[PDB]
């Protein structure tokens, strides 16, 4: 699996995939989950984003499989994606963490 995650086309695809997941997965109210969690993350000036795995297993479940079988590579990618998502949400959050 790690040999697959580290293939650069696969890596770039995975980055787009997780970004799409964060921006489009919602509560049954239609409210974006990680939109609201990122909003809260910045308000707390936190370095941590709590991604619920069951959400990732509901949509783009292959990424949940890679995350289970190969977390060290996947979490590096997902960290970059999460920073991208919150930098999109808050400009210059790179100054805070």
């Amino acid at each position: 699996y790690s040999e697959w995650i580290t293939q650069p086309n696969v890596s770039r695809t995975i980055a787009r995939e997780l970004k799409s997941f964060l921006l489009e997965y919602t509560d049954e109210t239609g409210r974006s989950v990680y939109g609201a969690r990122i909003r809260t993350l910045g308000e707390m000036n936190s370095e941590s984003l709590e991604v619920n795995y069951r959400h990732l297993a509901e949509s783009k479940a292959i990424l949940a499989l890679f995350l289970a079988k190969c977390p060290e590579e996947m979490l590096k990618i997902f960290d970059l994606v999460a920073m991208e998502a919150t930098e999109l949400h808050y400009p210059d959050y790179a100054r805070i963490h």
Partner: protein, 564 residues
């Protein structure tokens, strides 16, 4: 009218002719304490009389009762008084029990002269017309309002005075109609007393950066309650800053350089002494816009700093040690963001003074320090008097803080200002969370029955801090109608409520004609009708104090009145 702004020189020349000598003290200044603008005007005036070496006495006075006492014990050698920051809105010739024939001398000619002058330096309106026209002894320093506005009332006063049949009936009914429509106007401040003294200093040729700074301070003290007057006066202050600023450029900061810039002076609370976070958090306007008295507004303020790219720990640093790059970039960081939260009126240019190497201070911060020193600086009638004595004594801590030699006293003022605003804020969230503000049909009512820091609000200026904090919050809401407010607070020691009648006002950024305070005469009418025991001697006559048992009948009679 009595002395127009073109002829303040003539009144000052009359002062030096009558009541100046090496021989004796002859000039008394009564100044209303608990008034920053009156304080700054008196400081400017005292520097003038020091330079001209005029022997004089300053008396700080709380209210009209002490005024009548202190006037009564003046010796005939005192042939000029200056009344600063009060007295224009009451018939002083009647109230001080003047008979002009007791003071008249040297008629020759259809003419008179008098053994004592009473010059009045007051910015409150409507003028009492017995002062402006009736009296020959009272001498008001007019801003131009009389000549601009009161021609009909002038004609009505003189014709009614002349008019000791059908024509007689018509005329007397007409001019009583005019005068009883001019009176029962709500009270309002139209100028800064300090700017009037500054115009006098311009006439005499006495302007300098010290007197200009005092004028800036006295004018800046009006900004919270009387925003339109501050906006009227601000261009003239810019002119004078540029006229008196030196010609040097690339001026290296040097321990002797007094500098007085116009520069961005945001509408945050004690920015250069607070942290950044606290200067947002304890600002009246920020609290009003964000509804910061609840956790959602608190979340919004955190959201703002996060979006600005400011770490919260940096935001909470005391401003001197707060990151230099942020301090350079702050104007950009605000410009990019504060419209996004509707806080765009935070952006402002204001007067900032920095002397040598000992920091920078805006007029906003400086008046906050001075007010805090007035508020918290140092059997019932005796206890009340011993409290008013503390406030008369607090005047001299604000006075001495105006001197650069005593900046440790200014730092006392800064610290007291922070802790006072904290007390105001906690009382405010108590009021709004427990929903104390009862919405009576004509006006909103808020009565503090109990709570921490209750023993501060027996001071009028602290009560007005809380009133202004409330009024900004109500004004910046969309759902609420703009209505007058009564704020009251029990003193458990004297067993009397101190009660303040407060105007509403528009949102801070909007622009319409001014709103007047009509609690000033409504309280008088209820006082005149009632058997209750209520004191109405404060110079800010929209403030009264009343026994606890009498309040609810008083408020019931007030809300039955149509005058508000």
């Amino acid at each position: 009218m009595y002395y127009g702004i073109s002829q303040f020189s003539e009144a000052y020349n009359k002062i030096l002719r009558n009541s100046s000598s090496h021989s004796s003290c002859q000039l008394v200044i009564f100044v209303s304490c608990l008034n920053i603008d009156a304080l700054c005007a008196t400081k400017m005036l005292s520097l003038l009389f020091k330079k001209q070496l005029v022997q004089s006495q300053i008396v700080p006075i709380f209210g009209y009762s002490e005024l009548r006492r202190h006037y009564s014990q003046l010796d005939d050698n005192i042939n000029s008084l200056l009344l600063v920051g009060f007295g224009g809105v009451i018939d002083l010739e009647a109230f001080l029990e003047i008979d002009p024939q007791e003071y008249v001398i040297d008629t020759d000619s259809g003419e008179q002269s008098f053994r004592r002058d009473i010059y009045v330096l007051d910015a409150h309106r409507p003028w009492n017309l017995d002062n402006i026209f009736g009296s020959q002894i009272i001498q008001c320093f007019d801003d131009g309002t009389v000549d601009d506005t009161l021609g009909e009332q002038k004609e009505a006063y003189y014709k009614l005075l002349e008019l000791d049949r059908k024509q007689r009936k018509k005329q007397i009914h007409e001019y009583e109609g005019v005068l009883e429509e001019y009176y029962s106007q709500g009270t309002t401040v139209v100028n800064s007393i300090s700017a009037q003294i500054y115009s006098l200093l311009s006439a005499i040729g006495e302007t300098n950066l010290s007197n200009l700074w005092l004028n800036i301070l006295g004018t800046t003290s009006l900004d919270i309650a009387y925003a339109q007057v501050y906006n009227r006066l601000y261009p003239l202050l810019q002119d004078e800053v540029k006229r008196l600023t030196p010609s040097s450029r690339n001026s290296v900061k040097t321990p002797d350089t007094l500098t007085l810039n116009i520069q961005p002076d945001y509408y945050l609370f004690l920015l250069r002494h607070s942290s950044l976070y606290d200067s947002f958090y304890y600002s009246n306007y920020v609290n009003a816009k964000l509804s910061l008295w609840n956790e959602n507004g608190k979340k919004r303020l955190h959201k703002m700093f996060a979006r600005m790219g400011i770490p919260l720990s940096t935001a909470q640093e005391t401003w001197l040690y707060m990151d230099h790059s942020i301090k350079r970039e702050l104007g950009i960081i605000f410009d990019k963001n504060l419209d996004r939260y509707g806080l765009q009126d935070i952006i402002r240019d204001g007067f900032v003074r920095t002397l040598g190497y000992r920091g920078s201070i805006s007029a906003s911060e400086f008046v906050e320090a001075l007010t805090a020193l007035l508020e918290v600086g140092n059997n019932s009638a005796q206890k009340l008097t011993n409290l008013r004595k503390r406030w008369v004594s607090n005047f001299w801590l604000s006075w001495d803080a105006l001197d650069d030699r005593k900046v440790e006293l200014l730092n006392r003022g800064i610290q007291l200002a922070q802790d006072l605003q904290r007390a105001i804020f906690n009382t405010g969230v108590a009021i709004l969370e427990k929903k104390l503000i009862k919405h009576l049909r004509i006006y909103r009512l808020c009565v503090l029955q109990d709570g921490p820091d209750l023993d501060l609000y027996r001071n009028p200026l602290t009560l007005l801090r809380l009133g202004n904090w409330l009024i900004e919050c109500c004004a910046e809401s969309e759902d609420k109608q703009l209505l007058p407010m009564v704020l009251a607070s029990i003193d458990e020691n004297t067993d009397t409520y101190l009660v303040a009648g407060l105007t509403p006002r528009y949102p801070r950024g909007l622009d319409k004609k001014p709103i007047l305070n009509n609690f000033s005469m409504a309280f008088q009418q209820i006082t005149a009708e009632t058997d209750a025991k209520v004191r109405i001697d404060n110079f800010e006559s929209s403030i009264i104090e009343i026994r606890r048992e009498d309040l609810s009948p008083f408020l019931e009679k007030l809300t039955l009145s149509g005058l508000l």
